[PDB]
Design a protein around this nucleic acid. Structure first.
Ligand SMILES: Nc1nc2c(ncn2[C@@H]2O[C@H](COP(=O)(O)OP(=O)(O)OP(=O)(O)O)[C@@H](O)[C@H]2O)c(=O)[nH]1
Ligand SMILES: [Mg+2]
Lengths: 326, 174, 1068
DNA sequence: AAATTTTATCTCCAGGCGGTATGCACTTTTAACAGTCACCCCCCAACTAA
DNA sequence: TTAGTTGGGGGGTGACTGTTAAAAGTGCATACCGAACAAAGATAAAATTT
């Protein structure tokens, strides 16, 4: 269920947070699902440049009227951020688009990885499908595909409380530690910028704004905490051993290491690789008996890099394309 | 260790207190009475003992149980963890020692024949800590033949041993 | 030596002490039970202390003189343990486990009467009275009444011991008193012929005139449809083989040797690599590794046996007797043969566990038959039964093979019973873990002595699909590279996966038939399921004769391979390959930053797709070349609805064009006066160009293209290649060769032909529906009425869809414009075929999408919109074409939905007599098996407690009924074709025969269709459903609704079925 | 009992996820004190067959 | 590589026979988690909720 913002003071606060960047504050702010456009109105008043991506056609004509005579600052585009670059291969229907086509239409040029941040994207995560959108973006980021082909795109979008706690789990908190937290902590630098209860936001469904008072009282029991979190892709994410070609093996290693949580690293290493587990564990700087839930993400990266860097063995992994779709 | 004796003892059972009540009297009753006979007499008394005494003993046992549980709850809190780790290591050491003792005794009970004696040991027996120092200082025939006899005699004892182990099913011992 | 003297005295004292303590109160088996009841314990005490040699027999008499749902998993395992201990001849272990379980309060409740009876029988076979009395005391203590088998065990014990008749007359006079009948004693299933002989001797000692019931003449079926087949009055010409008796006996001996071996070796058909140094080194390393693995497996098996025996000795269940069933060498060879054929990609843990247990059972059954002594009986019986199927030999009176097999004197047939599913899975898991742990290999095979560390051959790796994870066993890459390098020339097949070399054994009962030694299921289902077998075995024995005879007749058809077609196929396979024709290409001819990864992924996908097709083709071609100059037979069995399928999987007549091209009949029949015409018409039908023209025009077109036929027959690959353009290329080439040989001969009428000719039925399901409803329009539409030119619905559907598409594209929408000429019969065939079976629009789209995907000329980017358009228009065309068919479908669906609502599954009986049942139930729970490596999750089949699934029962009822009526017709047609001397094999709706007998087979088909559908199938179904389900008045209102639905069948139309006899294109 | 939510989608040719946590019911084991006798381990040398 | 062997001493504890009650062990059962990404559109019965 879409949860567009309506409040004005909250809009001003969010505009101040978004445009608080010191170097050239008005970045081209791609906004996902502005809906009624109070947030984009505040952003435009604060001097920024906004391109609106609507999945819903009805908000398109309304938003253009707000943008009339705004000196080309507002450019409405009918596109969905999480539907970018479908992997099916047919003709691309209007609700979806293409990253290359959109970025050429807007005139944004590709920028190398080592250079500074080209763009910034704001919006909100899907209400029910946060898991799916974190995985899709992670595959896009690790493979340098979709939008991340054009540099290091900034993403600042509200996320739920439970998924925020799952994403920021650590070895100190083992019950929530898992693969997604590891990959997202290795890939980016996540910080918290603002907090807001569900009551501040209002939910718009297909029928319209929620006019039910009984559901509103029922929604009162459904309060949670929405965290505004900011992701910046890390400059040194990619190394010689960890390349956009080898991310599948690392993903399989991470998914295998949490298949049986209460087990030492040696037990998983014996299955995954034919090499000597003792030697690798000694090289990375760990004791013989070390549980996987006590392993920091950088330790996982060091383990994978150490295994891949070995040159004596002609066969270093057992993972193969056959293990996919089976 | 210090923590071992520091750990409190559990309350003694009701029948044990009943036995302790009449144990000194039964000792004076018959000087020739032994521990087993006295225990069986006390067991017979418990067979003929009334139930009101059992109930009052059980109430006292509850009182001692609350006292003991409160005391051990207090004691378990104030201890340092390092002595706890030492105590747990030493209790598993004690358990392993108990298991080894039981294994050794089971082996002795299963008719274990004597191992080949050494000549140096026969010399010590013939000569008859100081004793060890003296025999070592003197250290710096018949036993060999006896050991040769032991080799000729104990080897078929192993061969003789196997059939009983087969009959009693202890094949894994072989 | 004072010390030695003391040692001897102490050892003597310790020995005496230990002896006394062991004698009164260590790993010692327990015999005397521990009895709970005070009276029973005192009785046993006084019995044991009464005499040094207690009077066990009269106490046995006195013990039974006074006579004062589904089993759980643990009970199922214990019963299997106790039954297996008898076969293995380990009785003390079973007795010890029984006393231990009887000892404790909780584990006493587990034991039931059957376990006591089994141990009692086991002790009786040895004639031991003391242990028998102990078990009787046990069963009396448990509070149970001895049954007939308990008396049988005692009688067998007395007979074997040859003890005085007094206890015997006392026992029989009681057996009369209690109400047990001595006649029921000799018909118990759980008895052997030796035990029956012994109890018969024991009874004969007391009663001299005791006579077993006299044997009866075999019954004969008297059903309305099968009366003509089994009539003893008439003229019969039964077919005979073309081989002498001695040749058939030699072939039977060869097949027996092959089945006893359990393995066969086939020389690989790959291009033989040049034997360089590399190949020799690889083969040497492979041999050394195989020897080391053999020794390691032997040691591991011995250690596991010791551990399991020790576990049993502590009073708990384990798999020790099951491991004792087979010899060590056979198990080791089975385990080494499994490893040799493991694919490089890997195999699942559960699949390996299932396969390993299934292979163990078959070898156990074969070994039991060999040891018991039934192989000699089979060898004596078959050599006499083979006089019926020999050219030189003669029989006093011709008859069906099953009738002669029975009349000759049937050998006593007993077969082992399947193990419980938990035992099967546990044994498979144990063997898989042993295989994984035992095998090891050097780290660096290519580099000699680079390092001495050892790594496992097989690894356990998780595979994740969506959220779910699956365990997978995968070989080490170096081992796969070594296997590829070695290029060994031998392939290995299982005995039951290779066509038989001798005539198949006649089917005589649901437990006999097909392969001579190995067990074959009459109905192919999952291992756990047993409902179909129960329904088959609970019916009058004479009802199944039609099905058994049809299966036996289909089994006895001699085959042979085609030389020229096989030679041409081998030429393309060994070289670069021809993918267009159907011969897979060698992997060598492969296509071979994110862009680089995408290219590599595409190439890898192509290679992976090619590598499986090449392996399957390799297996089929190796099997085909091994049978180049031999005559082989293929046995047949049914699915759970009646359709008949061959048993050998790889090489049979149900596969693709290559498989059907490589086969031909082994008996030659002269073409006669009307054979060349049928050969030419078959050629035109295989070509597929003239699919909508009368027979005359097809024959004329065959005459017109004679030049191309004679060119393609003489020079197959270097000529004009006209045969490549046919719909079936390979079969067309063989027909061309046969036609050329026929015409070039001096007398075409005298030429013998060994080539089968196919006759197919058009829209068979709709034909059966129209016959059931006796609709006139429907029958006229599907060629059930006389006509001059063939008629088909699927072409009319395409014409209507094309008209709508043209009118739509006139308005100019893109998708309707794209598909200008892609509206064909093939794209709209399977949808209109399955609308009457209840296909959904979601389903219809996934059929049209799949059909449009493979066109290769249609732009492969508009499929998503083309499928959605085509299915809307097909359903917009199909609203009002079928009426009676849809009425019958609605009645059947409603009846199955309401039957499934009451909590019972749907059942019906085929017109021939075979009973059918639908096994759809909701799966409430799945079991798990904890173990060393991983916990296997497996489905428990056969759980009848779960509720039925209304959605599956309602959707599967319309198709299964029609398919059953489809197979009843073939079996009638086959049975009545046999009497006229024809050769008949079938592929569901297509019937094959020699080129000369097509007219006779057509007449028989047209007659038996009318005979089958003259009976009131629908009314009989309604009556059976009313009697079976509505009989119980427990729920009055629901049963009333069910009866109202069941007693309303659709009314028939006005169509005389006699016109089918005069329809030319009903089967063509 | 009606409504809303969720789910499967014509059939046959023999197929199914794995790990961790908490709970219940019943059997098995262990420490509580008695006193006296017996047995084994040290104490440190010496050495020897598994 | 190490437990077992003989001497004079010493030390700790095993047995015994006894009931009692707490603590551990064993087999079965149910529930929740992973939500490896990857467009879209269709229809009515099963499934859960108030
Ligand atoms: N339910 C169902 N039945 C099928 C399916 N495919 C084939 N059949 C049955 O098999 C029978 C013969 O099918 P085919 O020989 O392939 O085609 P056809 O229906 O006979 O029509 P023609 O190709 O002209 O002979 C049909 O009558 C169907 O009853 C299917 O996919 N689903
Ligand atoms: Mg057909």
């Amino acid at each position: 269920f879409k949860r567009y913002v309506t409040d004005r003071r909250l809009a001003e606060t969010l505009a101040q947070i978004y445009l608080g960047k010191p170097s050239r504050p008005p970045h081209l702010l791609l906004e996902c699902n502005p809906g009624p456009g109070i947030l984009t109105q505040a952003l435009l008043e604060a001097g920024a440049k906004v391109v609106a991506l609507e999945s819903d056609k009805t908000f398109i004509p309304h938003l253009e009227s707000l943008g009339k005579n705004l000196d080309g600052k507002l450019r409405v585009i009918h596109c969905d951020f999480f539907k970018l670059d479908p992997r099916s291969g047919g003709v691309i229907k209007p609700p979806a688009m293409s990253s290359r086509g959109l970025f050429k239409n807007l005139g944004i040029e590709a920028v190398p990885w080592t250079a500074d941040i080209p763009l910034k994207v704001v919006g909100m995560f899907p209400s029910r499908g946060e898991k799916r959108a974190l995985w899709k973006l992670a595959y896009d980021l690790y493979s340098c595909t979709s939008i991340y082909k054009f540099g290091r795109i900034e993403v600042n979008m509200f996320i739920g409380e439970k998924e925020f706690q799952k994403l920021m789990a650590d070895p100190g908190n083992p019950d929530l530690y898992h693969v997604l937290s590891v990959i997202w902590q290795l890939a980016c630098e996540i910080k918290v910028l603002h907090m807001e209860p569900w009551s501040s936001f209002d939910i718009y469904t297909r029928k319209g704004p929620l006019e039910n008072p009984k559901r509103r009282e029922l929604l009162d029991q459904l309060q949670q905490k929405l965290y505004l979190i900011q992701m910046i892709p890390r400059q040194n994410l990619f190394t010689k051993n960890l390349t956009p070609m080898n991310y599948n093996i690392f993903f399989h290693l991470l998914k295998h290491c949490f298949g049986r949580r209460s087990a030492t690293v040696i037990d998983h290493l014996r299955s995954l690789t034919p090499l000597d587990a003792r030697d690798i564990l000694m090289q990375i700087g760990k004791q013989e008996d070390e549980k996987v839930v006590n392993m920091h993400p950088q330790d996982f990266k060091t383990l994978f890099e150490t295994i891949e860097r070995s040159k004596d063995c002609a066969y270093k992994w057992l993972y193969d394309e056959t293990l996919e779709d089976r | 260790s210090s923590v071992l004796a520091s750990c409190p003892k559990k309350p003694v059972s009701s029948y044990l207190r009943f036995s302790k009540e009449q144990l000194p009297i039964f000792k004076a009753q018959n000087p020739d009475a032994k521990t087993t006979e006295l225990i069986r007499r006390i067991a017979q008394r418990w067979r003929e003992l009334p139930d009101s005494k059992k109930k009052i003993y059980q109430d006292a046992y509850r009182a001692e149980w609350q006292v003991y549980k409160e005391e051990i709850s207090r004691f378990k809190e104030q201890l340092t963890p390092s002595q706890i780790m030492s105590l747990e290591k030493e209790i598993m050491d004690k358990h392993l020692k108990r298991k080894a003792m039981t294994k050794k005794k089971e082996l002795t009970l299963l008719g274990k024949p004597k191992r080949p004696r050494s000549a140096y040991n026969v010399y010590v027996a013939e000569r008859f800590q100081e004793k060890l120092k003296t025999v070592k200082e003197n250290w710096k025939e018949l036993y060999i033949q006896h050991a040769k006899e032991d080799e000729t005699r104990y080897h078929n004892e192993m061969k003789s041993w196997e059939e009983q182990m087969i009959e009693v099913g202890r094949k894994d011992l072989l | 030596w004072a010390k030695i003297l003391e040692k001897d005295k102490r050892t003597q004292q310790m020995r005496m002490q230990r002896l006394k303590a062991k004698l009164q109160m260590t790993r010692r088996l327990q015999v005397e039970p521990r009895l709970l009841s005070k009276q029973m314990a005192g009785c046993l005490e006084d019995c044991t202390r009464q005499a040094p040699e207690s009077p066990w027999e009269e106490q046995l008499a006195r013990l039974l003189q006074e006579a004062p749902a589904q089993l759980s998993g643990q009970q199922q395992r214990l019963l299997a343990f106790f039954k297996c201990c008898l076969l293995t001849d380990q009785l003390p272990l079973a007795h010890h486990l029984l006393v231990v379980h009887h000892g404790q309060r909780q584990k006493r409740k587990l034991l039931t009467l059957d376990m006591y009876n089994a141990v009692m029988l086991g002790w009786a076979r040895q004639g031991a009275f003391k242990e028998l009395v102990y078990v009787l005391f046990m069963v009396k203590d448990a509070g149970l009444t001895p049954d007939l088998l308990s008396y049988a065990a005692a009688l067998q014990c007395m007979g074997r011991q040859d003890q005085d008749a007094g206890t015997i007359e006392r026992c029989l006079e009681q057996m009369s008193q209690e109400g047990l009948k001595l006649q029921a004693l000799f018909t118990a299933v759980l008895l052997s012929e030796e035990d029956r002989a012994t109890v018969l001797k024991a009874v004969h000692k007391v009663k001299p005139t005791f006579s077993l019931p006299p044997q009866l003449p075999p019954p004969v079926n008297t059903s309305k449809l099968l009366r003509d087949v089994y009539a003893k009055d008439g003229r019969v010409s039964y077919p005979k083989l073309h081989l002498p008796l001695k040749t058939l006996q030699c072939l039977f001996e060869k097949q027996l040797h092959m089945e006893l071996a359990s393995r066969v070796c086939v020389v690989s058909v790959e291009k033989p690599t040049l034997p360089s140094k590399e190949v020799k080194h690889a083969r040497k390393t492979l041999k050394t590794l195989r020897d080391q693995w053999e020794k390691a497996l032997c040691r591991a098996l011995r250690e596991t046996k010791n551990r399991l025996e020790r576990e049993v000795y502590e009073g708990r269940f384990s798999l020790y007797p099951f491991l004792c069933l087979l010899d060590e060498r056979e198990v080791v060879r089975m385990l080494l043969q499994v490893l040799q054929a493991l694919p490089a990609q890997g195999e699942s843990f559960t699949t390996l566990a299932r396969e390993l247990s299934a292979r163990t059972f078959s070898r156990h059954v074969v070994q039991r038959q060999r040891v018991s002594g039934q192989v000699q009986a089979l060898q004596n019986h078959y050599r006499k039964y083979l006089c019926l199927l020999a050219s030189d030999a003669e029989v006093p009176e011709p008859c069906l093979p099953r009738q002669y097999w029975e009349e000759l004197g049937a050998p006593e047939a007993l077969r082992e019973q399947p193990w419980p599913l938990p035992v099967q899975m546990e044994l498979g898991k144990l063997l898989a873990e042993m295989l994984v742990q035992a095998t090891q290999m050097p780290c660096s095979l290519d580099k000699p002595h680079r390092s001495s560390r050892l790594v496992p051959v097989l690894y356990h790796v998780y595979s994740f699909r969506n959220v779910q994870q699956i365990g997978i066993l995968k070989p080490h890459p170096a081992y796969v590279q070594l296997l590829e390098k070695a290029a060994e020339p031998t392939l290995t097949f299982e005995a039951v996966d290779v066509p038989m070399l001798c005539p198949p054994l006649p089917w005589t009962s649901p437990h006999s038939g097909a392969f001579l030694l190995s067990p074959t299921k009459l109905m192919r289902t999952v291992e756990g399921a047993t409902q179909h077998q129960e329904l088959l075995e609970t019916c009058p024995p004479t009802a199944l004769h039609g099905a058994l005879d049809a299966l036996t007749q289909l089994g006895n058809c001699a085959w042979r391979v085609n030389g020229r077609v096989l030679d041409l196929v081998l030429q393309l396979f060994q070289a670069k390959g021809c993918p267009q024709l159907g011969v897979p290409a060698p992997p060598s001819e492969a296509p071979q930053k994110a862009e680089l990864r995408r290219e590599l992924a595409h190439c890898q996908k192509v290679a992976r797709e090619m590598h499986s097709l090449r392996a399957e083709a390799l297996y089929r071609l190796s099997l085909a070349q091994h049978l180049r100059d031999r005559v082989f037979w293929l046995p047949h069995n049914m699915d759970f609805r009646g359709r008949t399928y061959p048993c050998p999987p790889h090489f049979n007549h149900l596969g693709s064009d290559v498989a059907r091209a490589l086969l031909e009949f082994a008996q030659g029949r002269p073409l006669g006066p009307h054979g060349l015409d049928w050969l030419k018409i078959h050629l035109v039908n295989l070509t597929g160009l003239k699919k909508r023209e009368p027979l005359r025009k097809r024959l004329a077109f065959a005459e017109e293209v004679m030049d191309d036929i004679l060119d393609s027959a003489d020079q197959p690959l270097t000529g004009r290649k006209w045969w490549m353009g046919a719909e079936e290329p390979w079969q067309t080439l063989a027909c061309c060769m046969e036609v050329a040989n026929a015409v070039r001969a001096s007398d075409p009428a005298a030429y013998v032909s060994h080539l089968p000719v196919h006759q197919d039925g058009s829209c068979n399901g709709l034909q059966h529906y129209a016959a059931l409803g006796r609709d006139s329009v429907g029958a006229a539409s599907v060629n059930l009425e006389p006509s001059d030119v063939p008629q088909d619905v699927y072409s009319g559907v395409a014409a209507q869809v094309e008209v709508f598409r043209r009118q739509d594209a006139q308005r100019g929408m893109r998708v309707a414009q794209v598909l200008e000429g892609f509206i064909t019969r093939k794209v709209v065939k399977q949808t209109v075929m399955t609308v009457v079976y209840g296909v959904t629009r979601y389903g219809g789209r996934l059929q049209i999408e799949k059909r449009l995907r493979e066109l290769s000329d249609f732009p492969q980017e508009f499929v998503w919109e083309a499928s959605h358009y085509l299915v809307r228009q097909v359903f917009k065309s199909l609203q009002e074409m079928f009426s009676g068919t849809r009425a019958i479908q609605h009645w059947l669906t409603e009846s199955a939905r309401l039957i499934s609502h009451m909590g019972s599954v749907v059942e019906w009986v085929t017109p021939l007599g075979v009973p059918v049942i639908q096994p759809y139930r909701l799966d409430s729970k799945v079991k798990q098996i904890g173990g060393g490596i991983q916990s296997i999750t497996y489905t428990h089949n056969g759980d009848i407690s779960r509720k039925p699934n209304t959605r599956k029962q309602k959707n599967g009822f319309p198709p299964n009924f029609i398919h059953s009526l489809d197979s009843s017709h073939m079996m009638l047609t086959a049975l009545h074709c046999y009497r006229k001397g024809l050769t008949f094999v079938s592929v569901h709706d297509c019937y094959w025969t020699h080129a000369a007998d097509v007219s006779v087979m057509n007449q028989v088909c047209r007659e038996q269709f009318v005979r089958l559908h003259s009976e009131p199938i629908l009314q009989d179904l309604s009556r059976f459903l009313v009697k079976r389900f509505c009989s119980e008045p427990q729920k009055i209102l629901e049963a009333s609704q069910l009866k109202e639905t069941l007693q309303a069948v659709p009314k028939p139309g006005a169509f005389d079925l006699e016109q089918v006899k005069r329809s030319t294109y009903f089967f063509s």
